[PDB]
Design a protein around this ligand. Structure first.
Ligand SMILES: [Zn+2]
Length: 261
């Protein structure tokens, strides 16, 4: 399996995380609020390389604090190059973070504005040989973050939202083959990038954040689904996974870059 203690409740909420996970007050935490007014540009930035071509989806798994679509990362099937990055990151999995209401639920916020859910595409630098290892380096992981705003039903975000029923509780897994990750990527790829961390315990500060300025859409009828999901596991006391996002943290002495500007 894989247990789970922390969470998004009154006692286990992101508010207390700092306890078992001290770094939650680290000098590079995520998410953060991108203050467009202060965004900066770095001539050394390039356009996002999203080589999701050969990508091959495996299964979808409810890890008890979200649901995941896992890809085969033993080869460069699909990677992420250039952008603010240097090296090659292998996409290992993607997930989302919704809220208890359409009006909030995103970890990153642009000018304090929040969206329903926020998609997270997780890649790990190959120079470290494996996800685990890479996950402990200042530049081991890189996450491409796409927003989700209430609008029209998403054909793409449905093949996903479908299978959720077959993995409603913690631990369940569905064979979700032949799904294309790019299909959840907008068509415009301007992005914001800063040095952050994972937005969940262990909260390791080894993530490069590429947050795409252009949000993709989702029909409110779809957001209701994300909530159908269960926090507990087949047999525990049914607990709905309504909220599961970390509020924005201090940027500290960091600076969010922008591309093109
Ligand atoms: Zn995440």
């Amino acid at each position: 399996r894989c247990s789970h203690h922390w969470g998004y409740g009154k006692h286990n909420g992101p508010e207390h995380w700092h306890k078992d996970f001290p770094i939650a007050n680290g000098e590079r935490q995520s998410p953060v609020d991108i203050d467009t007014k202060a965004v900066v540009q770095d001539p050394a930035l390039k356009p996002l390389a999203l080589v999701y071509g050969e990508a091959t989806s495996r299964r979808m798994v409810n890890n008890g604090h979200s649901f995941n679509v896992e890809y085969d990362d033993s080869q460069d099937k699909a990677v992420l190059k250039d952008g603010p990055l240097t090296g090659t990151y292998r996409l290992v999995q993607f997930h989302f973070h919704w809220g208890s209401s359409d009006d909030q639920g995103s970890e990153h916020t642009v000018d304090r504005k929040k969206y329903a859910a926020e998609l997270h595409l997780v890649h790990w630098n190959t120079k470290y040989g494996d996800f685990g290892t890479a996950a402990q380096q200042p530049d081991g992981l890189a996450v491409v973050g796409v927003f989700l705003k209430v609008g029209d039903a998403n054909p793409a975000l449905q093949k996903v939202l479908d299978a959720l029923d077959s993995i409603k509780t913690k631990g369940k897994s569905t064979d979700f083959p032949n799904f294309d990750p790019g299909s959840l990527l907008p068509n415009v790829l301007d992005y914001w990038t800063y040095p952050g961390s994972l937005t969940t315990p262990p909260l390791l500060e080894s993530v490069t954040w590429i947050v795409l300025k252009e949000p993709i859409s989702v029909s409110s009828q779809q957001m209701l689904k994300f909530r159908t999901l269960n926090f507990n596991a087949e047999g525990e006391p049914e607990l709905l996974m309504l909220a599961n996002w970390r509020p924005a943290q201090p940027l500290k002495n960091r600076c969010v870059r922008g591309f093109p500007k």
